[PDB]
Amino acid sequence: KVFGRCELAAAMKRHGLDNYRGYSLGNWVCAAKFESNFNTQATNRNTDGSTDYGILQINSRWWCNDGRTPGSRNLCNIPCSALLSSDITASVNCAKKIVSDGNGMNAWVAWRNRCKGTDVQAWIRGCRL
Ligand SMILES: [Pt+4]
Ligand SMILES: [Pt+4]
User: Domain C-type lysozyme spans what residues?
Assistant: First the structure.
């Protein structure tokens, strides 16, 4: 499913991401925009053989099992395919574990490069939240 910007802001807010570990909603919407262009079905292969999955491009080296990343850790305890669902619950629950890991939202390279230190409130502007 391809989310609309305000639709995704509302689903993220409902799932408890607004201000989770200090990151306002706009940060999460911005990361999703640049990680996956709001498409829950986005996949991208990394040079190391791992793959990134879903709206927040969560990586199979650490976070999920895809059966093809030798020595992967599966920290979210989830098949990576679960991250591609139109229901963002699994992605959100896994993201919460990731952002708690010590490096906050810097774990998402597009957030670091394209969202960090920008006016992220613009991403929720005009939305009925
Ligand atoms: Pt569809
Ligand atoms: Pt909803």
Answer: 1-129
Residue in the structure block whose two tokens are 């992605």: 91
Catalytic annotation, pick one of 18, 35, 87, 119: 35
Q: How is 24-40 classified by DSSP, letter by letter? A: -HHHHHHHHHHHHTTBT
Beta carbons within 10 angstroms of residue 54's beta carbon: 26
Which numbered ligand comes closest to the C-alpha of 1?
1
How was this structure obtained? Answer: X-ray
CA of 55 to the centre of ligand 1 (A): 14
Cα 87 to ligand 1 centroid, rounded to whole Å:
11
